[PDB]
Amino acid sequence: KIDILDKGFVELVDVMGNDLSAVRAARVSFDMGKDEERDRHLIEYLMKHGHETPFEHIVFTFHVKAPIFVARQWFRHRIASYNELSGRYSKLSYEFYIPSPERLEGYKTTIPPERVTEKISEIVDKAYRTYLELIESGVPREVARIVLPLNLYTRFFWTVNARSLMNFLNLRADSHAQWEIQQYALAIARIFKEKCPWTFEAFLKYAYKGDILKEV
Amino acid sequence: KIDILDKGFVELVDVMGNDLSAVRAARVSFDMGKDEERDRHLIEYLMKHGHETPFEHIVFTFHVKAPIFVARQWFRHRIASYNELSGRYSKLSYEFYIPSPERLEGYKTTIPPERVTEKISEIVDKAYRTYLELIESGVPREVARIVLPLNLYTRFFWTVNARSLMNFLNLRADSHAQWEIQQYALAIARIFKEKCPWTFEAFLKYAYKGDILKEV
Amino acid sequence: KIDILDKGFVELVDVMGNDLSAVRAARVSFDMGKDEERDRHLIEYLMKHGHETPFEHIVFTFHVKAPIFVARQWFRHRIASYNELSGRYSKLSYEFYIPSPERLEGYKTTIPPERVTEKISEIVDKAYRTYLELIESGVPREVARIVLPLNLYTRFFWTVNARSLMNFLNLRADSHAQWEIQQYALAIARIFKEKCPWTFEAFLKYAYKGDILKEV
Amino acid sequence: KIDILDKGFVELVDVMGNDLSAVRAARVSFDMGKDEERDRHLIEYLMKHGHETPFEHIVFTFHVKAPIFVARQWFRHRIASYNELSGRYSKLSYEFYIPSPERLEGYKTTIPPERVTEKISEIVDKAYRTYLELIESGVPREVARIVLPLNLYTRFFWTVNARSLMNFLNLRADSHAQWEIQQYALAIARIFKEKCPWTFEAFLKYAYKGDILKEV
Ligand SMILES: Cc1cc2nc3c(=O)[nH]c(=O)nc-3n(C[C@H](O)[C@H](O)[C@H](O)COP(=O)(O)OP(=O)(O)OC[C@H]3O[C@@H](n4cnc5c(N)ncnc54)[C@H](O)[C@@H]3O)c2cc1C
Ligand SMILES: Cc1cc2nc3c(=O)[nH]c(=O)nc-3n(C[C@H](O)[C@H](O)[C@H](O)COP(=O)(O)OP(=O)(O)OC[C@H]3O[C@@H](n4cnc5c(N)ncnc54)[C@H](O)[C@@H]3O)c2cc1C
Ligand SMILES: Cc1cc2nc3c(=O)[nH]c(=O)nc-3n(C[C@H](O)[C@H](O)[C@H](O)COP(=O)(O)OP(=O)(O)OC[C@H]3O[C@@H](n4cnc5c(N)ncnc54)[C@H](O)[C@@H]3O)c2cc1C
Ligand SMILES: Cc1cc2nc3c(=O)[nH]c(=O)nc-3n(C[C@H](O)[C@H](O)[C@H](O)COP(=O)(O)OP(=O)(O)OC[C@H]3O[C@@H](n4cnc5c(N)ncnc54)[C@H](O)[C@@H]3O)c2cc1C
Ligand SMILES: Cc1cc2nc3c(=O)[nH]c(=O)nc-3n(C[C@H](O)[C@H](O)[C@H](O)CO)c2cc1C
Ligand SMILES: Cc1cc2nc3c(=O)[nH]c(=O)nc-3n(C[C@H](O)[C@H](O)[C@H](O)CO)c2cc1C
Ligand SMILES: Cc1cc2nc3c(=O)[nH]c(=O)nc-3n(C[C@H](O)[C@H](O)[C@H](O)CO)c2cc1C
Ligand SMILES: Cc1cc2nc3c(=O)[nH]c(=O)nc-3n(C[C@H](O)[C@H](O)[C@H](O)CO)c2cc1C
Ligand SMILES: O=c1ccn([C@H]2C[C@H](O)[C@@H](COS(=O)(=O)O)O2)c(=O)[nH]1
Ligand SMILES: O=c1ccn([C@H]2C[C@H](O)[C@@H](COS(=O)(=O)O)O2)c(=O)[nH]1
Ligand SMILES: O=c1ccn([C@H]2C[C@H](O)[C@@H](COS(=O)(=O)O)O2)c(=O)[nH]1
Ligand SMILES: O=c1ccn([C@H]2C[C@H](O)[C@@H](COS(=O)(=O)O)O2)c(=O)[nH]1
């Protein structure tokens, strides 16, 4: 479990396989016996020559807590499975992403960073109070919730194979992606590296297209 | 172009094929010649016996304007293509879905429907004014936008084949789906029926799983 | 490992999760604690009301040995991952599916079933001898192999989630599917039932569309 | 319609959109008005920076006649739609790919190229005669067909968007792909270039990974 932003997290729930799962699929192997030099070279060969289907046989399930504006970017990754909390069927919790003053580093703002912080807190507080007043007046939850801002936290389970995960890292562990999702992608990368060190290193060396994971 | 909700729309931008596209794919036909009785029966046979791959050769592109809370449900349909306006790269417009008083029919509310309406307007107005104040103070748009509520309108192009479209109609043209997306699904159905009448009628008769399209 | 046909097999290589994986994803649960009555009812509710995305969080990897004509049907299942032996990069083994005389039960043939059996053996033997003569004359393997018949055995790893697996069972564990792939689908079903008994029983009761698994 | 190999073909059956379809989707444009300089630069920007989702809004349907060994490679492309002739439900035609003597250029063979050619013809003739004898004895077609070699011609309709098509060209219009499928990929490229010249040129310049289309 890795903490992200002020109240977010990424947690690994389950994993199928490891580096050897890709090697075994690539060879269609009967062997369930590790030979680092040979297996590692095959992983590098596959990665450097674009043969990534074998990495689809490694699968992760994560539990993620993130603001809706981050989730909407994340859920654009179609080659994966999602299940998310419903604001139709339950009351949504009072939890919002409030950027730290540091979030505005490099931006000259005509009001102080601390005042930006508090103005965001103020509007989310008003919006949640309206949500609650609507709920408490008998407005159905599926309608009441529409006044809640995009920095509201949500949670989801994400099941994804290592190939689609690498695509996600190319796009999201990268400076062009929004900073907030970058932070999530760094945590995803860290877990991927822990479970699949040979694949991760080969990925970085041969296939990774982004500009942050080689710098951290 | 069909108007939906207070400010939304669905518009057909382009289409490839028609009922005969499915028949020709099913037969792997060299013929590019219509025989209603024969072609229509083949469509019904395919539909009633679950052989839906031939309908994937009919493709639509729609332009949709809908609130974000509707779009987030819609974008869960992974077997399709989407491109959506960015709140990272442009200023988002002042346009929100405000439910009509009629939206609360059947719900006894402890405040009048008209007061629910105005309370929703009030909070979206405050949130947008905060968004603008943040933008105008030099806060990057990608951060400023997080205070905007889920009833903010967005727009997207949606490219989808008739098989995935039929899945969308099963799930969204149905009473269990949120009323707001139901309204969009009715418009999608109407366009589908216009362009593919034989497939649509066969769908309704043999494969449609929902409970509204047989009643309208 | 389950033997299929004369020389085929299905073997489970790895699995992620079990019945509880779907329940936990459906609830977006922090709990990693089994409550049969409650969890089983949720599985049945999901299955009977068409909410099958939670079953995507259960994943299998199988190693399959089957004739090419069976593999070509199987590989039409796009929502899954495959890696297969290459006849471009290695010599293919002398192993063919020869139907038993029993395979023709119900068919009056103008030559005896045993003679059908031997005529199939004879032609595959001639084709393989030609393949070998071409290989041994320096014809590249990728070209030599084109003379080999469709009953040649191949092997592949198949990674598939429980939702796509259930689709596969609907279509292939069914009398309309070719008998030879039916036999494979029965083995897949047996493994699925072993690992996911609650999901399998709910599937049979509420969602399974075929006509053999309720009869065996 | 483009002839391929000795008896194969690729034919465009239908297309949705053109270069402007991608531009319009990328901008979520209301405009249905061409501005070459501006639209072409946007296409290049998208292509060079990996933003390829807009090209998914361009869709093709092809009719392809190819040998089974080519089709089995082609059908590995999961992000597309296929419908193919059935050897379960109809008699398969006597049509086989026979390599020309030129196919063996660069390979020293211990029998003459012309003799390789005739040995392939001989075995396919024997296999087809066996197929026919089995059919004519009352063996079901789905069983009789298993003796037919992989160079048997088949036909299919293929519906694919420009993004998946570009992936197909990266992998198949390339020297590592089997020569026979390369020839098909060259024809696909030619049609793609005809219908989408700006996208094709941008693809070649910025995203194409193979080593033949820049040389022809
Ligand atoms: C910096 C940045 C800015 C962005 N800006 C915008 C924006 O302004 N508007 C917007 O709408 N989106 C935007 N996106 C989202 C982007 O367009 C993709 O939806 C997202 O990056 C997921 O990428 P993907 O399609 O590769 O992932 P997945 O959907 O997981 O697809 C994985 C791979 O499968 C293939 N694939 C899956 N489905 C299909 C298909 N139907 N056809 C062809 N290939 C398929 C592709 O090879 C793809 O790479 C942005 C993303 C980034 C990183
Ligand atoms: C009434 C209702 C309530 C809902 N409540 C919730 C909720 O509380 N939480 C929540 O997160 N979502 C919820 N959803 C969304 C739902 O779980 C699906 O994401 C959505 O309905 C799209 O369905 P789909 O997967 O069939 O569509 P698509 O993603 O377009 O898939 C089309 C078909 O392709 C197949 N498919 C595609 N990808 C895969 C894959 N990876 N594995 C296996 N098969 C695949 C399936 O056969 C699927 O039917 C709800 C939907 C409805 C209609
Ligand atoms: C009895 C029988 C006879 C058959 N005869 C023929 C034949 O004569 N010719 C022939 O070519 N094939 C034939 N097939 C194969 C059949 O057309 C399908 O390719 C196969 O059954 C796989 O089904 P699927 O598409 O549901 O599986 P998958 O490809 O695994 O798809 C799973 C689900 O995802 C969705 N999905 C995936 N991709 C797409 C997409 N691109 N668009 C929309 N939805 C998508 C659908 O909801 C689908 O049900 C036959 C199959 C059977 C069982
Ligand atoms: C030279 C060469 C040699 C080959 N040798 C072999 C071999 O020996 N054995 C063998 O079995 N195959 C072999 N193949 C086939 C290869 O492994 C792929 O199946 C094929 O090239 C299609 O590529 P694709 O997966 O990118 O295409 P598609 O299946 O069309 O996928 C398009 C894109 O969508 C994404 N995608 C789709 N589905 C998934 C998923 N489930 N998970 C993650 N991402 C997904 C990926 O981004 C992918 O690039 C070979 C191919 C080539 C070109
Ligand atoms: C997806 C995939 C693609 C492959 N592509 C090639 C290839 O282009 N050339 C090759 O000689 N072997 C290929 N192989 C076989 C094998 O991995 C490789 O030849 C050697 O193992 C490298 O040591 C491939 C295997 C797989 C699973
Ligand atoms: C996807 C698909 C599935 C088919 N399934 C069957 C089948 O189960 N049985 C059959 O006799 N013909 C099948 N056919 C062939 C054909 O459509 C059908 O036999 C007749 O055309 C019905 O008039 C199929 C064709 C396609 C494209
Ligand atoms: C994919 C999915 C779909 C759901 N659909 C519904 C629904 O249509 N109605 C509902 O009341 N709850 C729905 N729920 C919530 C929940 O599973 C259900 O209300 C109760 O748990 C049943 O006991 C859904 C949950 C998921 C994960
Ligand atoms: C899929 C997609 C990705 C985009 N990515 C970026 C980006 O990384 N940076 C950016 O400034 N604009 C991006 N844009 C917006 C726009 O195309 C671009 O800023 C200008 O139009 C370039 O002239 C993107 C648009 C789309 C549809
Ligand atoms: O960095 C980005 C920018 C946009 N998008 C997608 C997500 C959503 O469907 C749409 C608008 O996203 S927004 O730009 O973050 O508002 O485009 C992303 O997925 N990532
Ligand atoms: O009717 C529904 C309910 C939920 N969902 C999906 C959309 C979103 O990813 C998540 C939460 O949606 S919400 O319930 O409308 O808040 O679940 C849907 O797609 N449709
Ligand atoms: O039962 C069937 C019949 C056909 N097919 C697909 C497989 C192949 O791509 C094509 C022809 O298959 S054959 O009918 O077994 O020759 O259609 C299947 O996938 N299953
Ligand atoms: O060039 C290649 C080599 C292999 N394959 C796939 C196709 C088939 O499912 C399997 C074996 O193909 S074969 O090598 O052409 O026999 O791997 C390809 O798709 N392309």
Side-chain angles (χ1 to χ4, degrees), chain B residues 177-193:
Chain B
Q178 183 156 354
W179 181 84
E180 284 82 3
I181 201 165
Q182 291 178 39
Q183 295 290 284
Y184 284 92
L186 291 171
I188 295 296
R190 177 175 148 188
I191 291 159
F192 183 37
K193 176 175 173 181

Side-chain angles (χ1 to χ4, degrees), chain A residues 149-167:
Chain A
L150 286 177
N151 61 341
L152 180 72
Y153 272 96
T154 187
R155 297 188 290 100
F156 58 101
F157 271 38
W158 187 39
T159 291
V160 62
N161 71 45
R163 187 180 188 186
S164 180
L165 183 153
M166 280 181 294
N167 189 59

Side-chain angles (χ1 to χ4, degrees), chain D residues 56-93:
Chain D
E56 301 181 9
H57 300 276
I58 304 163
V59 190
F60 302 86
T61 299
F62 300 94
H63 184 174
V64 182
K65 177 180 180 194
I68 290 181
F69 71 95
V70 170
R72 290 202 308 126
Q73 295 173 354
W74 204 316
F75 280 52
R76 296 299 300 278
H77 294 260
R78 297 161 292 179
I79 309 301
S81 296
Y82 303 83
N83 200 68
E84 182 177 8
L85 295 179
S86 168
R88 298 185 68 209
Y89 308 130
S90 66
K91 188 182 163 276
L92 303 166
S93 299

Side-chain angles (χ1 to χ4, degrees), chain C residues 45-162:
Chain C
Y45 164 88
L46 291 171
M47 196 68 73
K48 85 151 63 90
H49 290 98
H51 304 124
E52 281 197 29
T53 53
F55 302 106
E56 301 181 9
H57 300 276
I58 304 163
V59 190
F60 302 86
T61 299
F62 300 94
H63 184 174
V64 182
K65 177 180 180 194
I68 290 181
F69 71 95
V70 170
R72 290 202 308 126
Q73 295 173 354
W74 204 316
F75 280 52
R76 296 299 300 278
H77 294 260
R78 297 161 292 179
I79 309 301
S81 296
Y82 303 83
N83 200 68
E84 182 177 8
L85 295 179
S86 168
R88 298 185 68 209
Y89 308 130
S90 66
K91 188 182 163 276
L92 303 166
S93 299
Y94 178 82
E95 275 195 280
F96 296 92
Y97 166 62
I98 310 299
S100 62
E102 264 209 67
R103 179 57 174 94
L104 303 184
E105 275 178 1
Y107 296 96
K108 298 153 197 282
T109 59
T110 57
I111 68 176
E114 286 179 2
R115 180 63 192 155
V116 171
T117 290
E118 73 189 64
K119 282 169 67 90
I120 294 172
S121 292
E122 286 164 17
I123 193 66
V124 306
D125 186 77
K126 288 182 170 79
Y128 197 93
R129 285 193 267 98
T130 300
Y131 169 66
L132 218 59
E133 289 170 350
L134 296 180
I135 294 264
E136 293 184 345
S137 76
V139 175
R141 283 180 314 259
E142 66 176 10
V143 172
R145 79 200 175 87
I146 74 186
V147 302
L148 292 174
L150 286 177
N151 61 341
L152 180 72
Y153 272 96
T154 187
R155 297 188 290 100
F156 58 101
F157 271 38
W158 187 39
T159 291
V160 62
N161 71 45

Side-chain angles (χ1 to χ4, degrees), chain A residues 75 78-86 88-89, chain B residues 73 76-80 164 167 171-172 176-178, chain C residues 26 51 53-54 56 79 161 163-164 167:
Chain A
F75 280 52
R78 297 161 292 179
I79 309 301
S81 296
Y82 303 83
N83 200 68
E84 182 177 8
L85 295 179
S86 168
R88 298 185 68 209
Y89 308 130
Chain B
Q73 295 173 354
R76 296 299 300 278
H77 294 260
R78 297 161 292 179
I79 309 301
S164 180
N167 189 59
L171 292 163
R172 307 305 183 172
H176 298 91
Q178 183 156 354
Chain C
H51 304 124
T53 53
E56 301 181 9
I79 309 301
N161 71 45
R163 187 180 188 186
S164 180
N167 189 59

